[PDB]
Design a protein around this nucleic acid. Structure first.
Lengths: 240, 283, 130, 127, 181
RNA sequence: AUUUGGACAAACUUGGUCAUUUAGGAACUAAUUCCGUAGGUGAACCUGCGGAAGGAUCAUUAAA
RNA sequence: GUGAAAUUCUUGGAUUUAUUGAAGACUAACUACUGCGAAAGCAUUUGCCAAGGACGUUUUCAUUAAUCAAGAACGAAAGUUAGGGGAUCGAAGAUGAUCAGAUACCGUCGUAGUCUUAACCAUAAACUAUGCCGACUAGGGAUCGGGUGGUGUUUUUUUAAUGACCCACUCGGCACCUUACGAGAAAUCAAAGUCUUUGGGUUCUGGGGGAGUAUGGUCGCAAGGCUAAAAAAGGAAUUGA
C-alpha cells in the first residue's frame, strides 16, 4: 500500500533514481543439456553484466536450473517428471550443463495417493561408479487383484519389509553398476521400476512403482574434458 | 450494563460507609442514582464522574429540582485521565476492569481518602483478601497488603443483579495506611514481579531466570557507575558474577529457598533491605 | 425476513441473471385473487339480500383500447392542470432575499431598520405559532 | 524460437507477490506487490490488484522480450494454508488474457511432511 | 499457434463425469470454440485453442476453471455459471488448517457444520449466494470474493463450535445487510 | 601565561520612559457443554495445557 | 497484521528469488466405525535386546482355581528439585489499537513451560458415566490374525523360498446390523435376559433440589490507641414578557 492515508514510517527517507539499466547491462546465455537428451538446446539465462567474466563464470557455475522430461524429449507423457541440472561450464554464450537431481510433480503424487491401499517408500543412499554420492526415493502402491472381492488391498508388514529390502537391493546393485550418464539413460525409459516390478511379481500385486526423487549429495573432482565428452577448439575473427 | 435490584444492599452500603457530615464523596458510575441521592442526603458534597452521556442525562433529569442539586456536581469524561480532587470516601459500582486501575489510582492518590468502599468480583475480592499460606496470593495481593489494610464486608448475588452476570460479586472496604511506609514503589514492584513470576518455585530459581539476572546486572552496573566504582573482571558473564553476588545474598539471608506463597512482608522487607544493602536496586 | 434451509431451485447463473435484470408479484397476485373473491362474495350477498335484480359483476399481452374515459379525451394535461398546482411561491433561494406568499421579494440591504425589526417580529411570532 | 520465463506467483492470504525470474531462478526479472498495485490495506489481497499486477509484469516481460513463460504458483504453505488464493486465480486469468505464451502451470507450495505447532492454540487460530 | 491445457480427474469424480459428460462440452465447444479430448487412459481432459478458429485470450483459462470447479466437486450448472461470469472465485481450506480436531470430535464437527440434512449448508449458500462442497477435510467455497469471505467467516465459526441458533441470528443479520445493498 | 588605562559593554537589580499586545457600566449593528492442571493488575472472568459429548451427517464414490 | 488500522522493520534492500548450512522439534496424507498394549498409551528406516497375543500340536504335569483387606507395580497433562539444550508454540507479563461493532474483541515481543536426564508428584468426561470369575439363551453379514480343505487365476521353471486373489470350514478377536423369547421408568439392553417370590463362586457400598433457621460442634480473621465544615424568579429566555 502506498496510499495517501498509508501512515508514514522511517522507510523511504533516502531512495535512488532508477538508472541502473539492468536489462541493457545484462546478457543472455544459452544453457545446453548433455548429449543424453534430445532437446539439449533449452533455456537461456541472463548474466548480470559482462565486465566481470569471473562473475559471469561463478554465477553460471552456481546456476541450478530445472526442466521437465516432457519438454526435454518431446514426449509430453513425462510431464509429471522433472529434473534439476546445473551449468558446469561455459563457452561463448553457450553453457555446458549437467544433471543434478530429480523429482515428480506434487499433483501427480497427490493423484497417486489413494485411500484403500498402502504406499511403500524406499530411500536408499548410494555412491555411483562415477563416485557421485546420491540418495534415491522411490514409491509404490498396493494394488488389488482382478479377483479381489475386498474393498481394500492391504498386505503384511513382513511383505512390506521384504519388498523394501528387495527394492533397495535392486537400486544399490544398479547404481553401483552404473555411472552418471548411464544412470540418466537408465532413468529415461522407466525400465528400472519395471525390473523391480518383475522382481516383486511373486510377492504381491503392486502398482504405481516409481522412483520419486534423486538427491545429489557429493560430486567428485572437476573434469571439463569429461563434460565436453558427455555433451558432445575455437578460433577468433581478426579484429583490427 | 447492569442495574441493581436491592435498595436494602444500598442501605447496607451507606451504613458500612459510615458517613461523616463533613465529607466530599466521589462516585464513579453513580448508576440510576439511589446511592447518589443517599450520599447527597448524608454528606456535605457529592461529586459524580460519569462517562455515559445518556446516564448522566437521566441522572440530571432525576435530580433537577431537589435542594441538594447545588451540592451535587456531575463531571464528564474518563476519570482515569481527567483531574480528580480530594475526597474522604469513595463509593462506586463500576465494571471491575477499570476498577483495578482505579484501585491503584486511589492507593497512589496524594492525600488519600480516609476510608473507601468498593464492589468487586468474588474471585477478585478473594484474590485481594489472599493471605500468606493461601492459594490466591499474588502481586496485587502483596501490593495491597503492603500499602494498606483491608476488611471484608459482604457478598453480592448475580440473581440479585439485573441482568444476572456470570461471575459473582462482593463488597469490600479499603483503608489506606497513614502514614504510608516509605517503600520505593518502583523497587517494591520490581521485587514483587521477580518473586511472583512463579509463586510455588524457589526464589533461588526465580532469580536464576536469565532476564532478572540481566536486569539486576544492568541496575547494579549503572549503580556502580553512578557511585563511580569499578567491578572486578568476570571471566564469564557479568550476569554470572552478580548472580554469584546475589547467591551470597541468598545464602546470607537463608530465605531464597522458600515458597513465594508463604513468606510475609517482614521477610520481604528484610530481603529488599539486603538488596539495597548490597547495592541492588530494581529501578 | 427469514432464510430457507432447503436446496436452492436456481443456480448461480440463474440468480445472477435474475438480479442482472409493486411490493412483490406474490402480494400483487394475492391482492388480485382476494379482490375477485370479495367481488364475487359481495355479489352473492347482494343476490341474497336484494329485492331488485342484480346480474353477475363481471368475468374473471397485446395492444388494448380503454373504452370508458375518465376525461373528455380531448383535453390537454396542461389544460386540466391548475396554475396554482404548477407554480406556488416559496422563500427565496438567496438568504439576502426574503420572498413572501403574496409574492413580494425584499433584499435585506435595501430595507430600513424599523422594517427589519417588524419583519423579525412577524417571523418570530409566526415561528412561535409554529 | 520463443524464450521462457519463470512466473513465481506467491498467493498470500493478504498479499500477492508476482515475481518473474530467469533460468535457475537467479536473474530476477520483475517483482510486484498487491498493495503497491492498489494503494490500499484491505485490497492488498484483491483480485483487482492481481489483475493490475499481472498486466504490469506482463508489460515488463514483453519489455525485456520474454514471450513464453512457465508459471508456478505458491500458496502460503508452512503450518498455514497451502491452497493458493482467488487472487492467484485472478492473476492467472489476467496473465492468460495478457497473452504471454503459457508453457506450463505449476503449484509448488511448501508442504510440511511433519511440522511443528502452529500459533493457534487449543481453541482455534482465527475467529 | 495452438495452445493447450490438461486437467486430471479422480475416478469417483470420473463416474459422474462419464455419467453426464454429454452436457459438459456443448457450453464450451460452441461458445468458446475449444478443442476437447479426454484420455481415460490418463484420466485427464485436454483443451486446445486453435488460432484461426479461436482468437480469445481468456477462454482456455475459463474452461480450465470450469473443469476445475466440477472436478473439485461442484455441480454442472454452477460450473457453467463460472463460465458465464469471470468474477466467480473458489476458496478451499481445511479443518486442520483452522483448528485441528481428532476423530469423533472431527465427526461431530462435520455433523455440526452440515446440520440436519444439510439445512445449515443450504442456509449458508442462500445467504452468501455461494456454493459449498464438503469433503473429509477439504472445504470448497465458490462464489464472489466477499461472498466466500463471509461464508468463510461463518464456517470458521461453525468449526470452532458455534451454536446454530446464533449462527442463524448472524445469518439473517448478514443477509439483511446484503439484501439492503 | 600574566599586566596598565580607556571605550564598547552582554547580563542583572532597582526603578523611570514610551510602545505593543493581553468584569462593571455605557452605545450600536445583526438575528456450545464438562473434567483435571497451571496462571492471571484496564478481571460481570479470562488465558494455557491434557482430556469427554452429556455437540445436529448433505452430496459423489465396484469396473470399462 | 486484524473486522479495521496500528505499533514492527525495510537503501547497511526487507519481503522475495536462487544456492546452501546450522539448530531444535515433528513423524502428516497412507489412516480404517483397522491393529497393538492392564490402562494411561502406542504410526520415519534399520538393527539389537528381550517380551507378549493368537493359531497349530496324539508334548508336559495333574488342581496347581477364583474373589481378595495389608502390601506391590504402572499411571495423560500440568506442577515441584537438580542438569541439558531450548527451533516452534506458549499460564504470566509487557505493550500498538481501543476504532461504532463485537454481527467480524486482537497485533507484537516474550519469562516459566513445551522436550530431555535423575527424581517426586498419583489427578482426569482416567466413561462402555454400567464388580469380578464362570455357565446358558437370537439370527445375518463383516473384517483382522492363525490354521485346514479344495477350486481356480496371478504366479514360477537343480533355487534358496512356492506368494497373491476364490470359495468352504475352523478357532480367536475389533466389531457391525436386525429383531425378542426376556426385562424395563422408558430409552433401551443378547445383557441392564435366564419361567410369579427370589440360592453358580466372590471384594465394596447405601437405607434429589434449592431455600430458610439454630450452632459449644469446629476452624480461622482482625483493627486503632490524638483527628475537626456550616435561604435565593437575588430564575430562564436566537424560544421570553
Amino acid at each position: 500500500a502506498v496510499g495517501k492515508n498509508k501512515r508514514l514510517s522511517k522507510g523511504k527517507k533516502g531512495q535512488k533514481k532508477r538508472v541502473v539499466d539492468p536489462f541493457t547491462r545484462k546478457e543472455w546465455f544459452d544453457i545446453k543439456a548433455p548429449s543424453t537428451f534430445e532437446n539439449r538446446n533449452v533455456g537461456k539465462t541472463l548474466v548480470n553484466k559482462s565486465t566481470g567474466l569471473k562473475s559471469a563464470s561463478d554465477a553460471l557455475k552456481g546456476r541450478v536450473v530445472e526442466v521437465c522430461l516432457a519438454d526435454l524429449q518431446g514426449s509430453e507423457d513425462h510431464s509429471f517428471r522433472k529434473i534439476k541440472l546445473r551449468v558446469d561450464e561455459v563457452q561463448g554464450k553457450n553453457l555446458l550443463t549437467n544433471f543434478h537431481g530429480m523429482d515428480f510433480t506434487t499433483d501427480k503424487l497427490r493423484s497417486m495417493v489413494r485411500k484403500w491401499q498402502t504406499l511403500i517408500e524406499a530411500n536408499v543412499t548410494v555412491k555411483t561408479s562415477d563416485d557421485y554420492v546420491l540418495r534415491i526415493f522411490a514409491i509404490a502402491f498396493t494394488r488389488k487383484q482382478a479377483n479381489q472381492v475386498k474393498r481394500h488391498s492391504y498386505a503384511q508388514s513382513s511383505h512390506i519389509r521384504a519388498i523394501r529390502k528387495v527394492i533397495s537391493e535392486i537400486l544399490t546393485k544398479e547404481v553401483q553398476g552404473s555411472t552418471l550418464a548411464q544412470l540418466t539413460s537408465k532413468l529415461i525409459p522407466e525400465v528400472i521400476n519395471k525390473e523391480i516390478e518383475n522382481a516383486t511379481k511373486d510377492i504381491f500385486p503392486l502398482q504405481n512403482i516409481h522412483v520419486r526423487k534423486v538427491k545429489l549429495l557429493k560430486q567428485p573432482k572437476f573434469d571439463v574434458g569429461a563434460l565436453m565428452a558427455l555433451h558432445g577448439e575455437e578460433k577468433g575473427k581478426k579484429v583490427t | 450494563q447492569h442495574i441493581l435490584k436491592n435498595p436494602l444492599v444500598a442501605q447496607g452500603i451507606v451504613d458500612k460507609a459510615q458517613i461523616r457530615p463533613s465529607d466530599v464523596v466521589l462516585e464513579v458510575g453513580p448508576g440510576t442514582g439511589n446511592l447518589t441521592v443517599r450520599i447527597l442526603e448524608q454528606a456535605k458534597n457529592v461529586v459524580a464522574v460519569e462517562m455515559d452521556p445518556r446516564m448522566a442525562a437521566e441522572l440530571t433529569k432525576r435530580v433537577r429540582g431537589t435542594p441538594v442539586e447545588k451540592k451535587l456536581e456531575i463531571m464528564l469524561g474518563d476519570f482515569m485521565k481527567t483531574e480528580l480532587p480530594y475526597f474522604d470516601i469513595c463509593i462506586s459500582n463500576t465494571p471491575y476492569q477499570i476498577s483495578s486501575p482505579l484501585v491503584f489510582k486511589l492507593i497512589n492518590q496524594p492525600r488519600p481518602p480516609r476510608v473507601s468502599i468498593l464492589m468487586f468480583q468474588r474471585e477478585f475480592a478473594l484474590r485481594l483478601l489472599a493471605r500468606p499460606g493461601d492459594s490466591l496470593y499474588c502481586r496485587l495481593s502483596a501490593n495491597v497488603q503492603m500499602w494498606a489494610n483491608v476488611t471484608h464486608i459482604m457478598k453480592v448475588g448475580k440473581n440479585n443483579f439485573r441482568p444476572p452476570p456470570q461471575v459473582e460479586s462482593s463488597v469490600v472496604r479499603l483503608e489506606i495506611k497513614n502514614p504510608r511506609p516509605q517503600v520505593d514503589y518502583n523497587e517494591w514492584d520490581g521485587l514483587l514481579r521477580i518473586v511472583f513470576v512463579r509463586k510455588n518455585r524457589t526464589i533461588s530459581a526465580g532469580f536464576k531466570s536469565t532476564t532478572v539476572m540481566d536486569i539486576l546486572e544492568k541496575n547494579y552496573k549503572t549503580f556502580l557507575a553512578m557511585n563511580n566504582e569499578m567491578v572486578d573482571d568476570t571471566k564469564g558473564s557479568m550476569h554470572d558474577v552478580v548472580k554469584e553476588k546475589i547467591d551470597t545474598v541468598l545464602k546470607e539471608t537463608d530465605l531464597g529457598d522458600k515458597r513465594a506463597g508463604k513468606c510475609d512482608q517482614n521477610d520481604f522487607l528484610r530481603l529488599l533491605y539486603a538488596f539495597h544493602q548490597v547495592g541492588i536496586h530494581f529501578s | 425476513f427469514e432464510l430457507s434451509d432447503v436446496k436452492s431451485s436456481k443456480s448461480l447463473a440463474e440468480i445472477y441473471e435474475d438480479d442482472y435484470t409493486a411490493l412483490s408479484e406474490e402480494l400483487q397476485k394475492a391482492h388480485s385473487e382476494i379482490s375477485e373473491l370479495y367481488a364475487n362474495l359481495v355479489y352473492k350477498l347482494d343476490v341474497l339480500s336484494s329485492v331488485h335484480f342484480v346480474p353477475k359483476p363481471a368475468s374473471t399481452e397485446t395492444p388494448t383500447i380503454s373504452m370508458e374515459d375518465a376525461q373528455p379525451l380531448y383535453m390537454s394535461n396542461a389544460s386540466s392542470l391548475a396554475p396554482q398546482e404548477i407554480y406556488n411561491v416559496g422563500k427565496a433561494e438567496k438568504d439576502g432575499e426574503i420572498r413572501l406568499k403574496n409574492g413580494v421579494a425584499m433584499s435585506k440591504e435595501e430595507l430600513t431598520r424599523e422594517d427589519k425589526n417588524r419583519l423579525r417580529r412577524a417571523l418570530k411570532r409566526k415561528r412561535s405559532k409554529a | 524460437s520463443q524464450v521462457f520465463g519463470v512466473a513465481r506467483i506467491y498467493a498470500s492470504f493478504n498479499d500477492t507477490f508476482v515475481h518473474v525470474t530467469d533460468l535457475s531462478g537467479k536473474e530476477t526479472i520483475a517483482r510486484v506487490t498487491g498493495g503497491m498495485k492498489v494503494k490500499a490495506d484491505r485490497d492488498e489481497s484483491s483480485p483487482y490488484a492481481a489483475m493490475l499486477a499481472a498486466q504490469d509484469v506482463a508489460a515488463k516481460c514483453k519489455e525485456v522480450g520474454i514471450t513464453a513463460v512457465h508459471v508456478k504458483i505458491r500458496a502460503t504453505g508452512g503450518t498455514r494454508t497451502k491452497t493458493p488464493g482467488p487472487g492467484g486465480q485472478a492473476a492467472l486469468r489476467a496473465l492468460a488474457r495478457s497473452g504471454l505464451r503459457i508453457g506450463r502451470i505449476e503449484d509448488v507450495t511448501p508442504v510440511p511432511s511433519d511440522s511443528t505447532r502452529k500459533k493457534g492454540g487449543r481453541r482455534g487460530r482465527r475467529l | 499457434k495452438f495452445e493447450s491445457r490438461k486437467i486430471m480427474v479422480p475416478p469417483h469424480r470420473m463416474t459422474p463425469l462419464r455419467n453426464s459428460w454429454t452436457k459438459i462440452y456443448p457450453p464450451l465447444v460452441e461458445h468458446l470454440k475449444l478443442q476437447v479430448r479426454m484420455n481415460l487412459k490418463t484420466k485427464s481432459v485436454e483443451l486446445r485453442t486453435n488460432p484461426k478458429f479461436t482468437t480469445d485470450p481468456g477462454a482456455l483459462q475459463k474452461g480450465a476453471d470450469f473443469i476445475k470447479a466440477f472436478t473439485l466437486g461442484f455441480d454442472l450448472d454452477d460450473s457453467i455459471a463460472l463460465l458465464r461470469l469471470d468474477d466467480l472465485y473458489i476458496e478451499t481450506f481445511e479443518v486442520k488448517d483452522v483448528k485441528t480436531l481428532t476423530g469423533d470430535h472431527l465427526s461431530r464437527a462435520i455433523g455440526r457444520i452440515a446440520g440436519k440434512d444439510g439445512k445449515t449448508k443450504f442456509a449458508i449458500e442462500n445467504a452468501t449466494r455461494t456454493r459449498i462442497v464438503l469433503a473429509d477435510s477439504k472445504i470448497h467455497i465458490l462464489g464472489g470474493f466477499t461472498h466466500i469471505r463471509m461464508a468463510r467467516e461463518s464456517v470458521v465459526s461453525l468449526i470452532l463450535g458455534s451454536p446454530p441458533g446464533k449462527v442463524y441470528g448472524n445469518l439473517r443479520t448478514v443477509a439483511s445487510r446484503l439484501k439492503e445493498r
